[PDB]
Amino acid sequence: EVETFAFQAEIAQLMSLIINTFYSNKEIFLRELISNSSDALDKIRYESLTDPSKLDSGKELHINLIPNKQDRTLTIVDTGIGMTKADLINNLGTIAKSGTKAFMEALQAGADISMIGQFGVGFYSAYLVAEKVTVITKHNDDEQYAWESSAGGSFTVRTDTGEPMGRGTKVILHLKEDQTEYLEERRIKEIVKKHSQFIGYPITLFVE
Numbered sequence: 001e002v003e004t005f006a007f008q009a010e011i012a013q014l015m016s017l018i019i020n021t022f023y024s025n026k027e028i029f030l031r032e033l034i035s036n037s038s039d040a041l042d043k044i045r046y047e048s049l050t051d052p053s054k055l056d057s058g059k060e061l062h063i064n065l066i067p068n069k070q071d072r073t074l075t076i077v078d079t080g081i082g083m084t085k086a087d088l089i090n091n092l093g094t095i096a097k098s099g100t101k102a103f104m105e106a107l108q109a110g111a112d113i114s115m116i117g118q119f120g121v122g123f124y125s126a127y128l129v130a131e132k133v134t135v136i137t138k139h140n141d142d143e144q145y146a147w148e149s150s151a152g153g154s155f156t157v158r159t160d161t162g163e164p165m166g167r168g169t170k171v172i173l174h175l176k177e178d179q180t181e182y183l184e185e186r187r188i189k190e191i192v193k194k195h196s197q198f199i200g201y202p203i204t205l206f207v208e
């Protein structure tokens with residue numbers, strides 16, 4: 001039903017660093033997630049030029065941002081390529097076992113956290129604002145799975161019993177209690193407009 005996995009030691013230490021380093025510019029997390037999405041839509045757009053048959057589970061290639069004050073969550077939803085269970089398990093828990101060592105040296109040599117996307121591990125910035133992250137993903141190959149983690153060394157994968165969802169990936173941030181500014185419409189618009197104004201796909205910010 002629920003499988004529990006250990007972060008590979010580097011990823012866990014990176015996560016630790018991200019959660020523990022005092023660092024005020026937290027808002028860069030959104031750009032990292034919006035940018036993961038765009039890649040994933042690129043990558044599905046790519047494969048449907050040799051099989052316009054993969055858009056059968058979707059076609060509309062977009063990114064939604066969904067704030068919810070009462071659950072204190074901000075969700076970044078994309079209809080991109082999605083991940084299989086092994087994608088999910090490898091490229092969240094291992095996979096850039098590499099891009100992570102690079103980053104953590106880079107951090108000496110006055111690199112600062114805001115340049116995390118350059119090493120392919122931007123996703124982990126979500127931990128600047130969230131006590132818990134849930135990733136709901138559905139790939140053309142496979143079932144629909146829920147990945148989950150509040151850090152602390154491990155994560156879980158279970159098959160998703162929730163809203164079936166076409167194809168793509170939903171990242172749900174359960175916000176830290178003092179980062180509820182990222183739930184707010186003007187706060188979000190300012191950040192999108194500042195860091196992601198030229199993304200190739202529509203980004204719809206929902207209202208509550």
Ligand SMILES: CCNC(=O)c1cc2c(-c3ccc(Cl)cc3Cl)nc(N)nc2s1
Binds near residue numbers: 082121
């Ligand atoms: C099967 C090929 N797809 C992938 O490898 C993907 C990884 C991601 C990711 C992703 C990438 C890196 C990390 Cl550390 C975490 C995630 Cl959720 N996000 C999104 N929104 N879509 C995809 S598709």
